[PDB]
């Protein structure tokens, strides 16, 4: 049973840090979508002025 308690950790060290990075850097990539939302909202505002 001690071996079994060690059994789960076998194929987990493979990607624990890989997940730590995948869920970190890709989430860090959200500033681009933020700034693009900013420009899209500016486009919506000006386009609405034009539509008015």
């Amino acid at each position: 049973d001690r071996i079994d308690s060690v059994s789960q950790l076998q194929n987990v060290a493979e990607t624990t840090k890989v997940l730590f990075d995948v869920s970190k850097e890709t989430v860090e990539l959200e500033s681009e979508a933020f700034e693009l939302k900013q420009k899209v909202e500016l486009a919506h505002e000006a386009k609405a002025v034009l539509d008015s």
Partner: protein, 89 residues
């Protein structure tokens, strides 16, 4: 046709007075040129965001939030917390 030609005349030269000539209209007291062309031209922005819609107020996108690059204090507490959570794994 005279009824067609006369109608065209009375509906064109008078249409000239209304639109094609800047004579406004004698039958109607307020000219639309002093009413629509500039003030009601703000009616478009009256329905829109006034001095703000055509302007498109400057709103630069800001930065997202992070840990202030703080591993002196957050890292050790995070490690202890994660190990405490591991106590019921």
């Amino acid at each position: 046709q005279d009824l067609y030609l006369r109608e065209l005349k009375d509906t064109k030269l008078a249409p000239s007075t209304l639109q094609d000539a800047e004579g406004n209209v004698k039958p109607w007291n307020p000219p639309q040129k002093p009413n629509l062309p500039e003030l009601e031209l703000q009616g478009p922005e009256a329905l829109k965001a006034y001095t703000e819609q055509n302007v498109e107020t400057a709103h630069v996108a800001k930065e997202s939030e992070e840990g202030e690059s703080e591993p002196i204090e957050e890292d050790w507490l995070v490690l202890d917390d994660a190990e405490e959570t591991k106590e019921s794994h």
